[PDB]
Design a protein around this ligand. Sequence first.
Ligand SMILES: *[C@@H]1O[C@H](CO)[C@@H](O[C@@H]2O[C@H](CO)[C@@H](O[C@@H]3O[C@H](CO)[C@@H](O)[C@H](O[C@H]4O[C@H](CO)[C@@H](O)[C@H](O)[C@@H]4O)[C@@H]3O)[C@H](O)[C@H]2NC(C)=O)[C@H](O)[C@H]1NC(C)=O
Ligand SMILES: *[C@@H]1O[C@H](CO)[C@@H](O[C@@H]2O[C@H](CO)[C@@H](O[C@@H]3O[C@H](CO)[C@@H](O)[C@H](O)[C@@H]3O)[C@H](O)[C@H]2NC(C)=O)[C@H](O)[C@H]1NC(C)=O
Ligand SMILES: *[C@@H]1O[C@H](CO)[C@@H](O[C@@H]2O[C@H](CO)[C@@H](O)[C@H](O)[C@H]2NC(C)=O)[C@H](O)[C@H]1NC(C)=O
Ligand SMILES: *[C@@H]1O[C@H](CO)[C@@H](O[C@@H]2O[C@H](CO)[C@@H](O)[C@H](O)[C@H]2NC(C)=O)[C@H](O)[C@H]1NC(C)=O
Ligand SMILES: *[C@@H]1O[C@H](CO)[C@@H](O[C@@H]2O[C@H](CO)[C@@H](O)[C@H](O)[C@H]2NC(C)=O)[C@H](O)[C@H]1NC(C)=O
Ligand SMILES: *[C@@H]1O[C@H](CO)[C@@H](O[C@@H]2O[C@H](CO)[C@@H](O)[C@H](O)[C@H]2NC(C)=O)[C@H](O)[C@H]1NC(C)=O
Ligand SMILES: CCCCC/C=C\C/C=C\CCCCCCCC(=O)O
Ligand SMILES: CCCCC/C=C\C/C=C\CCCCCCCC(=O)O
Ligand SMILES: *[C@@H]1O[C@H](CO)[C@@H](O)[C@H](O)[C@H]1NC(C)=O
Ligand SMILES: *[C@@H]1O[C@H](CO)[C@@H](O)[C@H](O)[C@H]1NC(C)=O
Ligand SMILES: *[C@@H]1O[C@H](CO)[C@@H](O)[C@H](O)[C@H]1NC(C)=O
Ligand SMILES: *[C@@H]1O[C@H](CO)[C@@H](O)[C@H](O)[C@H]1NC(C)=O
Lengths: 291, 49, 48, 236, 49
Amino acid sequence: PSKEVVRFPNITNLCPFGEVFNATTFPSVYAWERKRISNCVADYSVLYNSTSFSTFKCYGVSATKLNDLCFSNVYADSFVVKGDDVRQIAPGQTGVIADYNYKLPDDFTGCVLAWNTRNIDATQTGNYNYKYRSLRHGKLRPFERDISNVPFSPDGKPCTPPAFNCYWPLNDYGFYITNGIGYQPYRVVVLSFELLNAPATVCGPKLSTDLIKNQCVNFNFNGLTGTGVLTPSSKRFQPFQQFGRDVSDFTDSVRDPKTSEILDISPCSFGGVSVITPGTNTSSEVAVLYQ
Amino acid sequence: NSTSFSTFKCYGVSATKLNDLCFSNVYADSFVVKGDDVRQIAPGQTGVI
Amino acid sequence: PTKRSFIEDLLFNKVTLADAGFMKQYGECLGDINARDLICAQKFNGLT
Amino acid sequence: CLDFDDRTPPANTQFLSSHRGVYYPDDIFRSNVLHLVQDHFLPFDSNVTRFITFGLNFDNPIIPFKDGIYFAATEKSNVIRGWVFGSTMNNKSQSVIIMNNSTNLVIRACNFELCDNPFFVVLKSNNTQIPSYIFNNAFNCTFEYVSKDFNLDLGEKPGNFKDLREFVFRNKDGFLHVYSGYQPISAASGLPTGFNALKPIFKLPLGINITNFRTLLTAFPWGTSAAAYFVGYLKP
Amino acid sequence: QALNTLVKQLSSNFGAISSVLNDILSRLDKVEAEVQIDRLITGRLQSLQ
Ligand SMILES: *[C@@H]1O[C@H](CO)[C@@H](O[C@@H]2O[C@H](CO)[C@@H](O[C@@H]3O[C@H](CO)[C@@H](O)[C@H](O[C@H]4O[C@H](CO)[C@@H](O)[C@H](O)[C@@H]4O)[C@@H]3O)[C@H](O)[C@H]2NC(C)=O)[C@H](O)[C@H]1NC(C)=O
Ligand SMILES: *[C@@H]1O[C@H](CO)[C@@H](O[C@@H]2O[C@H](CO)[C@@H](O[C@@H]3O[C@H](CO)[C@@H](O)[C@H](O)[C@@H]3O)[C@H](O)[C@H]2NC(C)=O)[C@H](O)[C@H]1NC(C)=O
Ligand SMILES: *[C@@H]1O[C@H](CO)[C@@H](O[C@@H]2O[C@H](CO)[C@@H](O)[C@H](O)[C@H]2NC(C)=O)[C@H](O)[C@H]1NC(C)=O
Ligand SMILES: *[C@@H]1O[C@H](CO)[C@@H](O[C@@H]2O[C@H](CO)[C@@H](O)[C@H](O)[C@H]2NC(C)=O)[C@H](O)[C@H]1NC(C)=O
Ligand SMILES: *[C@@H]1O[C@H](CO)[C@@H](O[C@@H]2O[C@H](CO)[C@@H](O)[C@H](O)[C@H]2NC(C)=O)[C@H](O)[C@H]1NC(C)=O
Ligand SMILES: *[C@@H]1O[C@H](CO)[C@@H](O[C@@H]2O[C@H](CO)[C@@H](O)[C@H](O)[C@H]2NC(C)=O)[C@H](O)[C@H]1NC(C)=O
Ligand SMILES: CCCCC/C=C\C/C=C\CCCCCCCC(=O)O
Ligand SMILES: CCCCC/C=C\C/C=C\CCCCCCCC(=O)O
Ligand SMILES: *[C@@H]1O[C@H](CO)[C@@H](O)[C@H](O)[C@H]1NC(C)=O
Ligand SMILES: *[C@@H]1O[C@H](CO)[C@@H](O)[C@H](O)[C@H]1NC(C)=O
Ligand SMILES: *[C@@H]1O[C@H](CO)[C@@H](O)[C@H](O)[C@H]1NC(C)=O
Ligand SMILES: *[C@@H]1O[C@H](CO)[C@@H](O)[C@H](O)[C@H]1NC(C)=O
């Protein structure tokens, strides 16, 4: 390989890092919200100056490769939990939060962030503005919500709250300043995305280059790396597909982010070569035969 | 409803499958340690505890 | 024209060989990709 | 606030599907290759429950939503104009409605006060749509989407069914995948025999335990025009 | 037929996340992707043998 053909879409707007991670109001766990993210230059370097994350651990992708990759269908959830309930936000966990409020899928391609907010979400008296469910029938399916407020009974019959075996399913988080690390507010933001499957409009700051054709080059198309020869194609791509595949799993056709135009990818090496030698003892000359 | 566990992590079984499985020969130990010595209770660790 | 007799030509005509041309150049496997020739797919993976 | 006093028993006629109802699995271009996939598909030659209007049968009932449904509607006139998806269909559980009211397309999801009898009134005198009532309040909201403007012909047609529009709905991981497809057809019965591939059209990010579904019908005033829609359940 | 089968056997996940490389190497770092690369190498070597 000789050159680089890094090519990224036409994104010129910084991602919203103040609307999220710096929202004035954050929802409760039992009623969380979702936001769609698109047309972003995802550079988390801007968060180095303002926010410090106590726990930043996530799955499906390497942390160091977040600057070169390109994600699609990015969504951000947000809620507030206590210190001891911040470990329940993870694939394959049990607890009040992970069963009746917010359950993560077993397979998960995304990133989870959380930081401590005591100076904002606590007072000398009780806060009592954040609620969570502790009584429910069954368990929630991954990425689902339940905002209904109806009296709960073990038998299941509808009943009035003063009756026996009849409680309200929502309790109040009591946040005080004079509390330990546990029972302290923790704002949690969960990001989920899919990469290298669908056309993307959001990823980090990688400077695109010009197109090099009919030459062994190291291309980078929306995070997809590799070495090959780019050639004009004739295939017609439907507006909902970006990559192509062969009878053996390998990308042969990639739509150009900029200048949509379908390009063919072929291996650089091709052919065969044999060496004919009279014998090392006799001479060191050889004859090469290319098939 | 009553107790909140700061650390609930364990081995040999999945947490989500604890409602369907049936265990035998169950024993419970109990002691009190400090904050820095709570990480030493795990298979393959070194320390005073 | 051929150096074979009539019977040998008939025998050679019956067998439908895969016709490995023994010279499949890079130009042939880089163009006309819509045909999806099996041989061009094998030589790309080091099978000759 | 509206209801129907005159009632007609549902037909609930069962028919067969001629190996139709497939959709594109993933967003990857593949040509000249036979691909084997394993997902929730409509079984070949399976029962389909048909509901028919214009025979004094304004059905609009609730249909269970188990592992997704295959909605194929044949109609020469726009009588079916959307659906409503919910768990209990009351104002105690969130429900998502999709209505094809003219000049846009509306998707909204909120704690809706269902009127127990969805309505869409248009008079045949001037072929003009007049306001109707599907719900009475909205309460808590969590989605919203308004599409671009278009006008669909409300003029009644005397001919047989002219177009077939089939959809596939599936709820997985909090996403409601919608696939759409359309093909011309000229017949008056059962479901046209043939083959058609459904393309992805929507992926709605709403977290709802979708278990019941109900269609939205259009009535020409008690009584309406001819329109039949088939419901087929998918299985792994 | 043997050569065609060997060609079409290149799209099998031998216990890895994906059957196509330059995808494992693009989403995972050096240490994590090595396991999947070794799995793919083992499977393809078995096919060749
Ligand atoms: C989304 O909505 C769905 C659909 O409504 C809902 O799933 C289940 O709905 C069904 C139908 O209402 C309920 O299943 C049964 O309901 C009755 C009333 O309680 C009873 O037959 C059963 O309850 C008893 O079951 C056992 C006795 O055999 C005992 O455990 C006990 O006595 C129970 O009372 C049975 O539940 C059902 O209530 C719900 N589901 C659950 C988990 O309760 C579902 O809740 C919603 N889905 C999600 C993912 O949130
Ligand atoms: C879903 O809708 C329900 C019903 O409207 C919401 O519950 C109601 O929320 C309001 C505030 O939006 C509450 O009013 C306030 O409540 C307390 C005193 O109870 C106090 O802060 C104020 O004086 C004010 O009255 C209201 O009480 C509450 N309940 C009812 C029965 O109306 C609920 O918040 C909504 N959920 C979401 C997630 O939006
Ligand atoms: C992304 O931006 C590039 C900037 O070059 C666009 O390429 C230009 O497109 C215009 C028409 O929009 C042409 O007149 C120019 O000749 C193009 N310039 C080059 C250097 O190719 C490209 O079209 C944009 N892509 C999208 C999808 O908006
Ligand atoms: C719908 O499927 C049901 C399955 O029960 C069919 O109803 C009966 O099926 C049994 C079992 O094969 C037959 O012995 C009966 O004769 C069926 N009843 C009738 C009235 O046909 C039903 O036929 C299917 N609907 C179709 C094929 O349209
Ligand atoms: C949910 O819907 C029910 C049923 O329509 C509403 O119940 C009504 O309550 C009002 C007083 O708030 C009564 O005057 C009506 O007669 C009731 N309607 C019926 C049909 O019984 C209930 O209020 C709704 N909940 C809301 C809007 O929060
Ligand atoms: C179809 O639904 C849309 C969305 O609700 C309606 O368009 C809105 O109409 C209201 C009337 O008060 C306006 O305030 C909004 O600005 C409109 N939204 C737009 C233009 O995006 C539309 O009127 C409905 N069609 C009918 C009732 O015939
Ligand atoms: C003392 C009886 C022991 C019985 C042993 C058999 C099963 C026990 C398994 C689990 C019990 C504790 C589960 C953890 C609860 C977590 C609650 C939270 O994280 O908030
Ligand atoms: C400065 C000399 C370094 C020598 C390096 C060679 C070996 C060192 C290995 C371990 C030293 C520290 C062990 C940790 C002690 C834990 C005590 C506790 O957890 O309570
Ligand atoms: C973030 O929030 C702080 C207060 O917590 C505010 O002072 C600051 O301006 C915000 N930064 C942004 C919006 O970039
Ligand atoms: C970074 O934070 C400092 C204060 O710590 C502030 O003066 C400076 O303007 C900030 N820079 C940016 C680029 O936000
Ligand atoms: C749960 O705890 C609440 C107080 O938080 C108490 O009123 C209630 O009785 C408890 N319920 C059970 C079943 O222990
Ligand atoms: C058509 O008839 C309707 C219903 O009476 C009326 O509202 C409308 O003004 C008439 N004219 C047009 C041009 O729609």
